[PDB]
Scaffold this motif. Structure first.
Motif, PDB file in Angstrom:
ATOM      1  N   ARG B  87      12.121  -3.940   2.310  1.00 40.58           N
ATOM      2  CA  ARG B  87      13.552  -4.209   2.212  1.00 40.58           C
ATOM      3  C   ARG B  87      14.114  -4.731   3.525  1.00 40.58           C
ATOM      4  NH1 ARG B  87      13.145  -0.657  -2.281  1.00 40.58           N
ATOM      5  NH2 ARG B  87      11.224  -1.701  -2.958  1.00 40.58           N
ATOM      6  N   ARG B  88      13.573  -4.278   4.651  1.00 39.05           N
ATOM      7  CA  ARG B  88      14.089  -4.607   5.969  1.00 39.05           C
ATOM      8  C   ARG B  88      12.962  -5.178   6.815  1.00 39.05           C
ATOM      9  NH1 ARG B  88      18.300  -1.295   9.641  1.00 39.05           N
ATOM     10  NH2 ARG B  88      19.051  -1.060   7.493  1.00 39.05           N
ATOM     11  N   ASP B  89      13.314  -6.113   7.693  1.00 35.99           N
ATOM     12  CA  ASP B  89      12.314  -6.760   8.530  1.00 35.99           C
ATOM     13  C   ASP B  89      11.586  -5.729   9.378  1.00 35.99           C
ATOM     14  OD1 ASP B  89      13.146  -9.122   7.458  1.00 35.99           O
ATOM     15  OD2 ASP B  89      14.294  -9.769   9.213  1.00 35.99           O
ATOM     16  N   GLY B  90      10.257  -5.787   9.353  1.00 37.27           N
ATOM     17  CA  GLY B  90       9.444  -4.825  10.060  1.00 37.27           C
ATOM     18  C   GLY B  90       9.302  -3.489   9.369  1.00 37.27           C
ATOM     19  N   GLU B  91       9.885  -3.320   8.188  1.00 40.36           N
ATOM     20  CA  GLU B  91       9.827  -2.044   7.496  1.00 40.36           C
ATOM     21  C   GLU B  91       8.412  -1.790   7.001  1.00 40.36           C
ATOM     22  OE1 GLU B  91      12.249  -1.890   4.042  1.00 40.36           O
ATOM     23  OE2 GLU B  91      11.951   0.257   3.688  1.00 40.36           O
ATOM     24  N   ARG B  92       7.944  -0.560   7.181  1.00 44.18           N
ATOM     25  CA  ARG B  92       6.667  -0.104   6.653  1.00 44.18           C
ATOM     26  C   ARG B  92       6.896   1.161   5.847  1.00 44.18           C
ATOM     27  NH1 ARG B  92       2.862  -0.485   9.944  1.00 44.18           N
ATOM     28  NH2 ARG B  92       4.114  -1.669  11.445  1.00 44.18           N
ATOM     29  N   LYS B  93       6.253   1.247   4.686  1.00 48.81           N
ATOM     30  CA  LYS B  93       6.420   2.397   3.806  1.00 48.81           C
ATOM     31  C   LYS B  93       5.060   2.878   3.331  1.00 48.81           C
ATOM     32  CE  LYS B  93       9.810   3.852   1.987  1.00 48.81           C
ATOM     33  NZ  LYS B  93      10.712   4.392   0.936  1.00 48.81           N
ATOM     34  N   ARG B  94       4.846   4.188   3.367  1.00 47.61           N
ATOM     35  CA  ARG B  94       3.615   4.774   2.857  1.00 47.61           C
ATOM     36  C   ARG B  94       3.817   5.142   1.396  1.00 47.61           C
ATOM     37  NH1 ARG B  94       1.435   7.298   7.489  1.00 47.61           N
ATOM     38  NH2 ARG B  94       2.498   9.266   7.034  1.00 47.61           N
ATOM     39  N   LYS B  95       2.959   4.604   0.539  1.00 41.96           N
ATOM     40  CA  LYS B  95       3.104   4.762  -0.894  1.00 41.96           C
ATOM     41  C   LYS B  95       1.763   5.173  -1.477  1.00 41.96           C
ATOM     42  CE  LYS B  95       5.870   1.772  -3.066  1.00 41.96           C
ATOM     43  NZ  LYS B  95       7.043   2.636  -3.381  1.00 41.96           N
ATOM     44  N   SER B  96       1.816   5.972  -2.538  1.00 42.86           N
ATOM     45  CA  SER B  96       0.599   6.332  -3.246  1.00 42.86           C
ATOM     46  C   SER B  96       0.112   5.142  -4.056  1.00 42.86           C
ATOM     47  CB  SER B  96       0.852   7.531  -4.154  1.00 42.86           C
ATOM     48  OG  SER B  96       1.775   7.203  -5.176  1.00 42.86           O
ATOM     49  N   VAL B  97      -1.158   4.796  -3.886  1.00 44.37           N
ATOM     50  CA  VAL B  97      -1.771   3.685  -4.594  1.00 44.37           C
ATOM     51  C   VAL B  97      -3.096   4.153  -5.169  1.00 44.37           C
ATOM     52  CG1 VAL B  97      -0.634   1.905  -3.240  1.00 44.37           C
ATOM     53  CG2 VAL B  97      -2.836   2.813  -2.481  1.00 44.37           C
ATOM     54  N   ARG B  98      -3.436   3.617  -6.335  1.00 50.05           N
ATOM     55  CA  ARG B  98      -4.704   3.926  -6.969  1.00 50.05           C
ATOM     56  C   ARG B  98      -5.827   3.136  -6.309  1.00 50.05           C
ATOM     57  NH1 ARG B  98      -7.288   5.246 -11.940  1.00 50.05           N
ATOM     58  NH2 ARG B  98      -9.493   5.156 -11.336  1.00 50.05           N
ATOM     59  N   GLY B  99      -7.001   3.756  -6.239  1.00 45.62           N
ATOM     60  CA  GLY B  99      -8.148   3.103  -5.653  1.00 45.62           C
ATOM     61  C   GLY B  99      -8.661   1.964  -6.510  1.00 45.62           C
ATOM     62  N   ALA B 100      -9.602   1.212  -5.944  1.00 40.54           N
ATOM     63  CA  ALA B 100     -10.132   0.021  -6.591  1.00 40.54           C
ATOM     64  C   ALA B 100     -11.316   0.305  -7.504  1.00 40.54           C
ATOM     65  CB  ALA B 100     -10.544  -1.010  -5.535  1.00 40.54           C
ATOM     66  N   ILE B 101     -11.732   1.560  -7.637  1.00 33.17           N
ATOM     67  CA  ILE B 101     -12.850   1.919  -8.502  1.00 33.17           C
ATOM     68  C   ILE B 101     -12.302   2.259  -9.881  1.00 33.17           C
ATOM     69  CG2 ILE B 101     -14.940   3.290  -8.709  1.00 33.17           C
ATOM     70  CD1 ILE B 101     -14.657   1.595  -6.114  1.00 33.17           C
ATOM     71  N   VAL B 102     -12.780   1.544 -10.902  1.00 34.03           N
ATOM     72  CA  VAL B 102     -12.340   1.810 -12.263  1.00 34.03           C
ATOM     73  C   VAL B 102     -12.706   3.235 -12.646  1.00 34.03           C
ATOM     74  CG1 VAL B 102     -12.597   1.121 -14.672  1.00 34.03           C
ATOM     75  CG2 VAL B 102     -12.507  -0.618 -12.877  1.00 34.03           C
ATOM     76  N   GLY B 103     -11.839   3.869 -13.431  1.00 29.06           N
ATOM     77  CA  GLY B 103     -12.054   5.231 -13.853  1.00 29.06           C
ATOM     78  C   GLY B 103     -11.382   5.541 -15.175  1.00 29.06           C
ATOM     79  N   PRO B 104     -11.622   6.745 -15.700  1.00 29.25           N
ATOM     80  CA  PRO B 104     -11.038   7.106 -17.001  1.00 29.25           C
ATOM     81  C   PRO B 104      -9.522   7.168 -17.003  1.00 29.25           C
ATOM     82  CG  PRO B 104     -11.991   9.030 -15.946  1.00 29.25           C
ATOM     83  CD  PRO B 104     -12.388   7.853 -15.109  1.00 29.25           C
ATOM     84  N   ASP B 105      -8.889   7.444 -15.864  1.00 26.08           N
ATOM     85  CA  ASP B 105      -7.452   7.677 -15.812  1.00 26.08           C
ATOM     86  C   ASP B 105      -6.656   6.397 -15.581  1.00 26.08           C
ATOM     87  OD1 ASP B 105      -7.687   7.123 -13.052  1.00 26.08           O
ATOM     88  OD2 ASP B 105      -8.001   9.239 -12.590  1.00 26.08           O
ATOM     89  N   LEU B 106      -7.214   5.241 -15.930  1.00 23.75           N
ATOM     90  CA  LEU B 106      -6.471   3.993 -15.844  1.00 23.75           C
ATOM     91  C   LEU B 106      -5.746   3.731 -17.157  1.00 23.75           C
ATOM     92  CD1 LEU B 106      -8.746   1.448 -13.936  1.00 23.75           C
ATOM     93  CD2 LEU B 106      -6.624   2.455 -13.135  1.00 23.75           C
ATOM     94  N   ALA B 107      -4.415   3.674 -17.094  1.00 16.12           N
ATOM     95  CA  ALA B 107      -3.631   3.427 -18.298  1.00 16.12           C
ATOM     96  C   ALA B 107      -3.847   2.013 -18.811  1.00 16.12           C
ATOM     97  CB  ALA B 107      -2.151   3.668 -18.017  1.00 16.12           C
ATOM     98  N   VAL B 108      -3.811   1.029 -17.919  1.00 17.46           N
ATOM     99  CA  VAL B 108      -4.024  -0.366 -18.284  1.00 17.46           C
ATOM    100  C   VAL B 108      -4.896  -1.013 -17.222  1.00 17.46           C
ATOM    101  CG1 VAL B 108      -1.902  -1.125 -17.154  1.00 17.46           C
ATOM    102  CG2 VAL B 108      -2.956  -2.559 -18.902  1.00 17.46           C
ATOM    103  N   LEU B 109      -5.804  -1.877 -17.663  1.00 21.88           N
ATOM    104  CA  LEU B 109      -6.707  -2.607 -16.786  1.00 21.88           C
ATOM    105  C   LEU B 109      -6.521  -4.097 -17.031  1.00 21.88           C
ATOM    106  CD1 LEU B 109     -10.343  -1.648 -15.972  1.00 21.88           C
ATOM    107  CD2 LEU B 109      -9.711  -4.033 -16.315  1.00 21.88           C
TER     108      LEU B 109
END
Ligand SMILES: [Mg+2]
Ligand SMILES: [Mg+2]
Ligand SMILES: [Mg+2]
Ligand SMILES: [Mg+2]
Ligand SMILES: [Mg+2]
Ligand SMILES: [Mg+2]
Ligand SMILES: [Mg+2]
Ligand SMILES: [Mg+2]
Ligand SMILES: [Mg+2]
Ligand SMILES: [Mg+2]
Ligand SMILES: [Mg+2]
Ligand SMILES: [Mg+2]
Ligand SMILES: [Mg+2]
Ligand SMILES: [Mg+2]
Ligand SMILES: [Mg+2]
Ligand SMILES: [Mg+2]
Ligand SMILES: [Mg+2]
Ligand SMILES: [Mg+2]
Lengths: 258, 227, 945
Positions: B87-109
């Motif tokens: 949103r702001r120049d230089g802004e950094r935000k820590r967010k939860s992200v899913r890993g790149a390994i496919v797994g059973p708990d993926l809603a959509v691929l």
RNA sequence: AUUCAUAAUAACUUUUCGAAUCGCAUGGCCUUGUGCUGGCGAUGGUUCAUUCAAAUUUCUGCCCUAUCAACUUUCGAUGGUAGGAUAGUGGCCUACCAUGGUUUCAACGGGUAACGGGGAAUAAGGGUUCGAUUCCGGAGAGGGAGCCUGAGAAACGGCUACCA
RNA sequence: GAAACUGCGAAUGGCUCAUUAAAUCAGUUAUCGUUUAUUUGAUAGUUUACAUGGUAUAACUGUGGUAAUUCUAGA
């Protein structure tokens, strides 16, 4: 503060602008420009509080965007442009030229001048130095850099700058017997002739100035501006000719003319 | 899990709901950018090749490339990265992200059709979506139409027709970097300005030199007189 | 610009250009209804305005002017007594041209004239002259307000001196001629409005003199100035005309039709009529309409017949027929004109009548209208009927225009046979003119031209041209054309075995004549030299489609088994249409031969039919990929393989990028069907730009037919239609050049794109292994340096060469190519090219050669190429006794590459401080080299010399 | 007052800059070509100077407490040399060196319901007390810690941890 | 002329006196000890061109995840 300020309280504004203390809470902050903040008169004050041509800031803006005001022969559109000492303000539609010169009281005075006088200004030589490629230049009190100056020109001298071309026409050396104008201290606005220049290496130089009435006063060299030889100023002087006059006589001549 | 399959050649795309776990399991343990065979997914995808590009989990968090885990992790995202818009120049935000390994708990691929199989999908291969906008820069127009340099782009601009009620007209883009007389005039004026500046500086330097020489001569004469 | 500030923003203050203000400005003081200072007076208008201006303006010049004149203007009699000095001072100060003071001075000058009008007459000439100089001076310094002040002052003087000036308006106009004829449009426009007020105030008798004088002047910008002046005089209010407009139009008319007046005067009247007709509504124009119609009846005469005709064209065209109340009156006028001239004018008149007339009137008069065309326009009826078709083709058919054309054909038959050939030649392409084609012809030609066809000499192109135009007519012939065509056919093949471009077109024309097997045999006897021509293909297609399959035709097809394959060559041609006819042609031959048409042929035909647009851009790509997948999946014979591959290269000739994407993906996966063929196609395309392709085509004897068909009009709308009519007239004037030129336009396209070599290069890059096997044919280009050629006629582009070098590096075994050593030496030549990208490409190809020593140092050589790491690599790699320095045993092999690389770096323009430091470095490493290796570098420098 | 301004020589650079930008208008030359040339402005750009500013800095000046007399120096306290870092001076930090630095003219420590001043009150004068509070300057955004962006922030109506 | 990209601002202003006893602050010095957006004045013939790329994307079209947010995935 974490950076440069952008607001100016009315009480903190320069006294000599003569602003009402109850009109508002803030005063015009002069933008960056040729002159220092405390030694400059923003165009809004000049057009509104001095000439009374505009009734409020918005009308001043309307005048400026119409490009009717010229400072030193250049059109300016900033409301808070810092016009200062020895500045020429030209209004073509109204057909006037003004030179910003302090009165005896220590305030910028509305002094009307002729066109031929408006064609040139004066500048105190603040610095002389060789620029890049071995080109000498002189820096004046208003931030003007003029290249290829006359070699005889030195610091504390005065140079007559032609506004149209921005080149030196003539110059005055700083010597005893020269006519000088005080631009600082409680002697601000007075006029006199140099008597002696007292020098202190590593310190502030002091200059003795004698008025036409034979009164003498001492002032720091930084507040002295050579304006010509005695009896022959190169600019038209305001009323009073820079002579300080006492209070009793002030009562006296006010009564006499009244 | 749902599969969002995109055919980029046609620009088409469609979703397939999955129930059986065999195709889902052959999708397991793969990584974004890897390729899988469609036939394992199902007969309808016989002969197809699917490239994994990402996905979203049962909680909606997106998958991020470059993080090799099967579980979510909080990553400090900055400018110019996926899964985050500063949103702001230089802004950094820590967010939860899913890993790149496919797994059973993926809603959509999300999958990209690398190669088309023998059978045609109804919603992807059999349909095409036109490009929304055409070229704008002159060189892009020339490249798109394969024009020659002599040929003017002005006549080959793509124009779209617009109808408002009974009224109708056409609209075309503004080409940039077009050679026009104004640009030539600006270039010429710039050159002339610089040349004139150089000449003026030379003249001023010469005049200063003459003044210096004259002063130097007269002071030398005075020194001679003193001797 | 074109979207002027129609929609205004919410901004209170907006910028406006000087041209914008000038365009909006209009000189008419009376419309301004604001209170005026001079309306209220105690002593005089001058004094009333004089005091006010002292209050508002503070200019130095005005202040000086006021002081000089203040004492002498206190009273009206004082002004009268001192009038001379007052005027002199006013003129003196205006001449200074000080914009700050102009406004009060100009206003007072008008008010000065207001006080003493009749006395101002002695001052009039000087006052106008002063204004003209000021307005001329005003052009130099931009100020729209100055123009507004000046012209209103001029307008004011006219208002006050209206009585006296009107008596001698010609004198007043004479003063303003420099203004009315000035180069600027606006200065003329403003002056015209000011003078217009005087004109509308004139008595009719005085006006007649003035109009005569200006028309005499008409015999630069004066025409435009008069155009603006008069139209302003009539126009008063939106969709309304001034009351005096009747007399002005009548007076302008009577002079225009007068023989003494120049033709430009009538044209001036025409341009007026367009302006006022557009400006005014129906009701305001009804009174103006009747005065002309009565005058046209009254003054009709042989001498002025053309002039009346020209103005009548002006009325019918003006806003079409909407503004005309009663078309019946015009028809009566037209009949009277015909009973009592220039053919072209009438042709323009009647054609506009057909388009613009109301339905009811035309029904009553269409029969007489066309009979009149046969009466006098029969010489140029074809030019007329064409223009009528272009204006409104549908209406002409509805009103039996085709029947009259039949009568024209049977009346003027012998004199203009060739013109008929031109007309019918032009109309074939348009499908809407199908009815014109259905028109039957007079039989007598079909015998006459047939008689010549039976006995015609054909020994030169000039003789051939004679059959061509007769052939074009002969297509509509019904008298068993086939029997006559065939003898001519064998004659033309026999006499010209090697056809030129013109001959091929005629054969298609002759085939086009045929209407529902021997002639099929004849074309089969000689078709190898005519396949490329589009018209020949079309005629052949019409023939075979007409014929019905039977066993006999199977025998004919058997005799020439190579027919199908030969036609496949056409699919490489640059023309979409030619390919499409060949596809249509190929299919019907398969029907006649009975062999089953492959589904691939049908699919490719569909692709050609799809328009080339962004909307269809993607659709084209999938179709090409899909058929390519089908072609690869399904095994086929040589004909299909030869068909499809050639068609793919045809798609490359197309100038649509989406098409290229499909074929570039399809071709690499299907070339295995015929590797020899694809290489031949690639090889040919590479050589096409070098091959010079010029369309040499017969030039008929030049015809010097040209004349001013119609007058010139200032209004754009009328002029464009006039240009259209004249273009048709010019086309028919030169029938040989017109017939011959139309054939060229419809022949098709034969010039391949110059980029075609680039497309083949992409194909070669996608399949390096084919190029590697066939290196023999591609080798000469490298040794020729990709220059045709000692002066160079042509050379490959830098992009083309770059793709070429990529292919060489991609070869699996460059060492075993046909000429590896000579290629290796030339790759040396490229390695030192000043362009580093070329050097990297050469190095990659050099590294394609397997040499153990070079591989040991492969990284260092690459680093030398890179600009970023160039300096450090020199110090580390080439320093004598360095740890990473080249071993002495390997010094022999590597060093030539190193020396030539540094040579290319040495050729960089040493122009910026980084670049200059680069040149210093490359020379500074020379001492590290052994003296023999220093010597060879100097040899390399001197090799070019 | 200088190794100052400036200039010169020799090289060096993941090395910069030296206008691929935009508005309005259509003037002047001719070999008559959409040829050549050309006006008023906007926005950018190297360096220098000026201005608004910032940083550090020289001298003097703070209430109560001696029943707080020795303090600082192992983990920088005083100073030297070299480097690192800083926009830059500098124990600011690092390595090696010496043993220095303050103090009964009150150091150091403790208390403070201590933001400082311009000012306010009282008084005859000396003095005593108040001053969070319309202006100037400093610090903060629940408490510690650490940062991107940007000329300018250790920002909090920007971000990240921990504590509540 | 919505939206979005781009540029600038958001470090000004407003509030409070927690910490702070040569610290802050007042007066008075220094930068020959350094940064400085912006304003103002100077200042650059030495660097396919009738003008280069995606080594590229937003807004936008379309396919979606999450209960939820100024969340966002693929094309
Ligand atoms: Mg000093
Ligand atoms: Mg638009
Ligand atoms: Mg040090
Ligand atoms: Mg240490
Ligand atoms: Mg206190
Ligand atoms: Mg306080
Ligand atoms: Mg803070
Ligand atoms: Mg709180
Ligand atoms: Mg913080
Ligand atoms: Mg808050
Ligand atoms: Mg805040
Ligand atoms: Mg932004
Ligand atoms: Mg406290
Ligand atoms: Mg304490
Ligand atoms: Mg202190
Ligand atoms: Mg700004
Ligand atoms: Mg500047
Ligand atoms: Mg994308």
């Amino acid at each position: 503060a974490r950076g440069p300020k952008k607001h100016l309280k009315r009480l903190a504004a320069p006294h000599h602008w003569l602003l009402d203390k109850l009109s508002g809470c803030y005063a015009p902050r002069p933008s960056a420009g040729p002159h220092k903040l405390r030694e400059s008169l923003p165009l809004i004050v000049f057009l509104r509080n001095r000439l009374k041509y505009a009734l409020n800031g918005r009308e001043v803006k309307a005048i400026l965007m119409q490009r009717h005001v010229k400072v030193d022969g250049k059109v300016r559109t900033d409301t808070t442009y810092p016009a200062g000492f020895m500045d020429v303000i030209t209004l073509d539609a109204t057909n006037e030229n003004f030179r910003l010169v302090y009165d005896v009281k220590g305030r910028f005075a509305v002094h009307r001048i002729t066109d031929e006088e408006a064609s040139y200004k004066l500048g105190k030589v603040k610095k002389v130095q060789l620029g890049k490629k071995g080109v000498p230049y002189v820096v004046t009190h208003d931030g003007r850099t003029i290249r290829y100056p006359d070699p005889n020109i030195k610091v504390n001298d005065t140079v007559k700058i032609d506004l149209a071309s921005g080149k030196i026409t003539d110059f005055i050396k700083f010597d005893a017997g020269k006519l000088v104008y005080v631009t600082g201290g409680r002697n601000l606005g007075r006029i006199g002739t140099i008597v002696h220049k007292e020098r202190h290496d590593g310190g502030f130089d002091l200059v003795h100035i004698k008025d036409s009435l034979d009164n003498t006063f001492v002032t720091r060299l930084n507040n002295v501006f050579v304006i010509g030889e005695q009896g022959k100023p190169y600019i038209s002087l305001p009323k009073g000719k820079g002579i300080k006059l006492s209070i009793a006589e002030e009562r006296d001549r006010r009564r006499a003319q009244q | 899990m749902k599969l969002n399959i995109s055919y980029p050649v046609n620009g088409s795309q469609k979703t397939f709901e999955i129930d059986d776990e065999h195709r889902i399991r052959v999708f397991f343990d793969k990584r974004i950018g890897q390729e899988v065979d469609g036939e394992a997914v199902g007969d309808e995808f016989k002969g197809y090749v699917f490239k994994i590009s990402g996905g979203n989990d049962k909680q909606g968090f997106p998958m991020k490339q470059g993080v090799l885990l099967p579980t979510r992790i909080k990553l400090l995202l900055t400018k110019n990265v996926s899964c985050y818009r500063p949103r702001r120049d230089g802004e950094r935000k820590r967010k939860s992200v899913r890993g790149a390994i496919v797994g059973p708990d993926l809603a959509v691929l999300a999958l990209v059709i690398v190669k088309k199989g023998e059978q045609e999908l109804e919603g992807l291969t059999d349909t095409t979506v036109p490009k929304r906008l055409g070229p704008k820069r002159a060189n892009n127009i020339r490249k798109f139409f394969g024009l020659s340099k002599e040929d003017d782009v002005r006549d080959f601009v793509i124009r779209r027709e617009v109808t408002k009620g009974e009224k109708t007209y056409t609209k075309a883009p503004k080409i940039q970097r077009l050679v026009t007389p104004q640009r030539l005039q600006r270039k010429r004026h710039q050159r002339a300005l610089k040349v004139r500046n150089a000449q003026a500086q030379r003249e001023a330097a010469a005049e200063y030199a003459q003044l210096l020489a004259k002063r130097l001569s007269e002071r030398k004469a005075e020194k001679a007189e003193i001797r | 610009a074109k979207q002027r500030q129609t929609t205004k923003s919410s901004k209170r203050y907006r910028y406006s250009s000087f041209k914008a203000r000038i365009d909006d400005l209009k000189i008419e003081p009376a419309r301004n209804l604001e209170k005026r200072v001079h309306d209220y007076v105690e002593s005089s208008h001058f004094l009333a305005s004089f005091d006010q201006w002292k209050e508002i303006n503070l200019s130095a010049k005005f202040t000086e002017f006021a002081a000089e004149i203040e004492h002498d203007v206190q009273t009206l009699p004082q002004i009268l007594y001192h009038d001379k000095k007052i005027f002199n001072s006013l003129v003196s100060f205006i001449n200074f041209h000080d914009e700050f003071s102009l406004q009060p001075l100009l206003d007072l000058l008008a008010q000065f004239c207001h006080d003493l009008g009749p006395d101002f007459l002695k001052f009039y000439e000087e006052a106008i002259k002063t204004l003209i100089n000021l307005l001329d001076a005003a052009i130099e310094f931009e100020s729209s307000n100055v123009f507004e002040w000046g012209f209103n002052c001029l307008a004011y003087i006219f208002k006050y001196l209206s009585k006296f000036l009107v008596k001698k308006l010609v004198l007043t106009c004479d003063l303003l001629i420099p203004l009315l004829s000035h180069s600027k449009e606006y200065l003329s426009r403003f002056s015209a409005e000011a003078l217009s007020f005087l004109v509308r105030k004139c008595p009719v008798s005085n006006l007649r003199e003035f109009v005569r004088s200006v028309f005499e002047k008409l015999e630069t910008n004066l025409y435009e100035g008069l155009l603006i002046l008069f139209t302003e005089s009539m126009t008063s209010t939106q969709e309304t005309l001034h009351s005096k407009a009747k007399a002005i139009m009548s007076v302008l008319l009577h002079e225009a039709l007068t023989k003494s007046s120049p033709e430009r005067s009538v044209s001036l009247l025409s341009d007026i009529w367009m302006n006022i007709s557009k400006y005014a509504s129906i009701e305001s124009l009804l009174p103006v309409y009747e005065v002309m119609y009565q005058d046209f009846n009254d003054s009709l005469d042989a001498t002025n017949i053309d002039r009346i005709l020209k103005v009548l064209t002006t009325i019918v065209f003006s806003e079409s027929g909407r503004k005309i109340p009663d078309w019946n009156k015009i028809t009566i006028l037209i009949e009277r004109i015909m009973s009592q001239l220039s053919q072209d004018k009438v042709a323009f008149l009647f054609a506009l009548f057909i388009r613009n007339s109301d339905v009811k009137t035309l029904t009553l008069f269409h029969q007489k209208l066309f009979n009149y065309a046969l009466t006098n326009i029969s010489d140029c009826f074809l030019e007329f009927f064409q223009f009528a078709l272009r204006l409104s083709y549908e209406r002409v058919f509805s009103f039996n225009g085709l029947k009259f054309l039949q009568l024209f054909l049977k009346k003027n038959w012998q004199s203009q046979g060739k013109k008929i050939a031109l007309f019918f030649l032009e109309v074939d392409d348009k499908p809407e003119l199908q009815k014109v084609r259905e028109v039957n012809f007079p039989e007598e030609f079909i015998l006459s031209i047939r008689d010549f066809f039976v006995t015609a000499e054909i020994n030169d192109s000039n003789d051939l041209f004679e059959i061509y135009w007769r052939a074009i007519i002969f297509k509509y012939s019904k008298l068993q054309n086939t029997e006559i065509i065939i003898p001519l056919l064998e004659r033309i093949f026999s006499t010209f075995a090697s056809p030129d471009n013109f001959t091929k077109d005629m054969v298609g024309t002759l085939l086009k004549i045929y209407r529902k097997n021997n002639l099929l045999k004849t074309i089969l006897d000689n078709y190898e030299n005519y396949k490329e021509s589009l018209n020949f293909l079309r005629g052949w297609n019409k023939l075979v489609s007409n014929l019905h399959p039977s066993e006999s035709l199977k025998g004919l097809m058997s005799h020439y088994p190579s027919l199908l394959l030969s036609l496949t060559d056409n699919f490489m041609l640059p023309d979409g249409k030619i390919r499409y006819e060949t596809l249509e042609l190929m299919k019907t031959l398969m029907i006649l031969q009975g062999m089953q048409v492959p589904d691939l042929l049908s699919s490719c035909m569909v692709i050609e039919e799809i328009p080339l647009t962004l909307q269809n851009a993607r659709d084209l790509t999938i179709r090409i990929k899909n058929v390519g997948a089908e072609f690869g999946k399904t095994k086929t014979d040589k004909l299909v393989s030869s068909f499809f591959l050639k068609y793919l290269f045809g798609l490359l000739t197309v100038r649509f990028s989406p098409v290229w994407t499909g074929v570039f993906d399809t071709l690499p996966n299907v070339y295995t069907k015929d590797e020899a063929l694809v290489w031949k196609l690639v090889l040919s395309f590479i050589k096409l730009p070098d091959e010079n392709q010029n369309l040499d085509y017969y030039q008929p004897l030049l015809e010097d037919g040209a004349n001013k068909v119609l007058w010139d009009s200032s209004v754009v709308r009328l002029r464009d239609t006039i240009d259209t009519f004249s273009h048709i007239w010019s086309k028919y004037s030169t029938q040989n050049t017109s017939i011959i030129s139309t054939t060229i336009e419809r022949r098709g396209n034969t010039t391949y794109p110059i980029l075609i070599r680039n497309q083949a290069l992409k194909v070669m890059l996608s399949i390096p292994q084919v190029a590697e096997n066939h290196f023999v044919d591609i080798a000469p280009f490298v040794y020729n340096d990709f220059k045709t050629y000692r002066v160079i006629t042509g050379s490959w582009t830098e992009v083309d060469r770059n793709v070429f070098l990529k292919t060489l590096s991609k070869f699996k075994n460059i060492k075993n190519v046909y000429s590896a050593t000579e290629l290796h030496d030339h790759l040396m030549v490229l390695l030192g090219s000043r362009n580093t990208d070329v050097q990297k490409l050469a190095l990659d190809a050099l590294l394609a050669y397997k040499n153990p020593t070079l591989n040991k140092y492969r990284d260092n050589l690459k680093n030398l190429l890179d600009d970023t790491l160039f300096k450090d690599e020199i110090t580390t790699f080439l320093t004598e006794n360095g740890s990473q320095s080249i071993k002495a045993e390997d010094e022999k092999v590597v060093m030539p590459y190193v020396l030539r690389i540094f040579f290319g770096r040495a050729q960089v323009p040493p122009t910026s401080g980084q670049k200059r430091s680069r040149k210093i470095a490359v020379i500074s490493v020379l001492p590290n080299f052994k003296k023999p290796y220093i010597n060879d570098f100097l040899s390399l420098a001197s090799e070019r010399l």
